[model samples]
Target: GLTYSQTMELKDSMLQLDPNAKTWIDIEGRPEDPVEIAIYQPNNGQYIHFYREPTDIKQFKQDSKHSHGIDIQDLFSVQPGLTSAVIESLPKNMVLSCQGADDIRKLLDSQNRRDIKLIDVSMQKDDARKFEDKIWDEYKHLCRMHTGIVTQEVTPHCALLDCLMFEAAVIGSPQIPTPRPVLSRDLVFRTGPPRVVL
Candidate 1:
């Protein structure tokens, strides 16, 4: 998950890219770790669409990698601009988990999901934390409650906010590598130990 400062910086960057765009934020992380974030810009009315371009994705990838060594795609796919004249509809029975990241939810709801039943996974925080340990079981439980099915196919696009859930879903490798020094501290420390306080 992104740090608060990083979120602000990302917001700044997104605004720079499109001042009128509505930003949908997806945050993934445990309370104990830094959060990673994904931003989506959705434009719908004449059509349902997400405003993304090759240039935006490329610039964002380079900027994020240079600043944080983070591969943005690891968190979420860099979706190209999408538009649907009839609205990007989902099946009625499929559960929608907003998890409190409501920007996208608001868009979907306002556009075409008003009658769709929405699920909030924030209430299932404990289950989410242990998601990797019992992926099938947790998924079964969620599906059972929603559709009375013990086994059901889940979509790759199901939205999630928890890091454990996100990691389990994506099977991503470590995003931030351990920092290694270019020079050893021992080379310069011993001869100047008494000069100043660290």
Candidate 2:
């Protein structure tokens, strides 16, 4: 059931769910570019990462700068992932920021009368390999769960595409099937934190 806040918010935003809307999930960079690699959530909106980065919530808000004039479903068709589509679809002048779980919690708490309850379903990763394995397992599990509940049948191709896209975004890679080889050779990696000057 939609919360009163959500209902009111959507109504105020004039957002309607469309069956034919295109969606894309995006993990934006610092400057924010549409071409950057980001996770793309599925259309059914069952992916766990969606909770991690809920662009839908942003798009649904009445004063959201990221909100498009079209229905949510229409946004769904373009990029099921909320963050990417919002940034990509919105005007270049608009500033679209990606919020982590903590940020989201703060927003929810500020809006609701009741205390917001959040569950940390994030997995522990001892190593990169283990982390990747866990993520893939969760992705497949989500796909199965979504397929079971949805009225529409999900194709393997689509499911795999979504999974791979998400994995790529999380790991910061383009190709999913190709594994990243860990070589002892010292090289400066310019991606995430723990910048090694090897």
Candidate 3:
């Protein structure tokens, strides 16, 4: 008997062995992950076409560090400068609300994702106003979630945000040092009299 990951690793080894592999993503724009294409040779001369996922690609990349004569790449959109070809193809009530961050030219993996379409919906104005209480309220909550500290009553600036996220990465240490986000719970970042959240 094998642990789940152990069995997966065993199966994964077979996937990494194939050299003539390319990954394809059905859902279009571009992708962080994708299904791969490969050919497997079983016994003497029998060859089988195989489709696997990007995990194999990650494995291949690691393996490539030591070998040669192979080519593979991260997912690229089927069509450039186009998010959903399906969008212009179908629209009436099919699309509900599709809003994404402002990254117009870059094709997103989510664009080809079926059952949903995204469109630009970010604010266009200068964002002149600032919310005093709400910002810090949410700020404190984020502190708690990330570092288990509550932030209360504060100043707004860039470095503070960085510190919060950096600390979370230290405590979380989950990803390969990645995205810093989220908020609301406990609350504190302080000095002098040592401010506190209640």
Candidate 4:
């Protein structure tokens, strides 16, 4: 029987042997501290995707007061030009609501035909749903006041509101470090009949 640390090491070593291999390790009904690990190999031949800390699926079921029962327009205000740009940028089927102050700021700057800083807001997805309705209402009100054109783009997953210009221009050439490749292996022990005997 392997110790807890030993088991974990073994499991990690196995995973590293074949980067494409999927595995799961689980320990149950132990008197002391136990551990569980799960890895599933996809038959469809996709990249080996892994999430270290799992998300709480139950959080999706909990309804926020801000999401359902709120006026869409009362959350925040946008300038007329910015409002127009935002409405134009949204993709079809994607509703824009509950935008944070930063998002509004960016919209206003973009409307003035000024370049705005791009902040990666991917982490905000969890909070977006919580305040969706209020955000939507506020954005819609701004659009109404500005009387701007709202454009949409259709895709397989969902409709997106197309807004804002995404232009690419190289700022400066910077040296990037090259990453070193890692090597790993799995070793198995075996017992067999000896070919030479005394």
Error of 4 at 102 (Å): 17
Off by over 4 Å in 1: 1-79, 83-87, 92-94, 124-127, 131-198
Candidate lDDT (C-alpha), each: 0.32, 0.29, 0.26, 0.23
The residue ranges of model 2 lying beyond 4 angstroms of the native Cα positions read: 1-74, 78-101, 119-130, 141-198
What are the runs in model 3 whose C-alpha is more than 4 Å off?
1-111, 143-198
Error of 3 at 196 (Å): 24
Instruction: Give the RMSD in angstroms, all C-alphas superposed, for model 2.
Output: 19.6
The numbered model that scores best in TM-score is 1
Q: Which ten contiguous residues of candidate 4 have the minimum total lDDT?
A: 159-168
Output the TM-score of candidate 1.
Answer: 0.28
Model 1 per-residue lDDT tens digits across residues 91-173: 33334334464544555555566654445445454444445444433442321111211122232212211322443433332
Whole-model lDDT, model 2: 0.29
By TM-score rank, best first, the candidates go 1, 2, 3, 4
Ranking by lDDT: 1, 2, 3, 4
The lowest-lDDT stretch of 10 consecutive residues in candidate 1 is 44-53
* 39-145 per-residue lDDT for model 2 (tens digits): 22233332212211224444333212221112233223222233322222222222211223354344333444123243322323222123334445545453221
lDDT of 4 by residue, 137-185 (tens): 3333222211222223111000010010000001111111221111111
Superior by lDDT: candidate 1 or candidate 3: 1
Instruction: List TM-scores for all candidates, in order.
Output: 0.28, 0.21, 0.21, 0.16
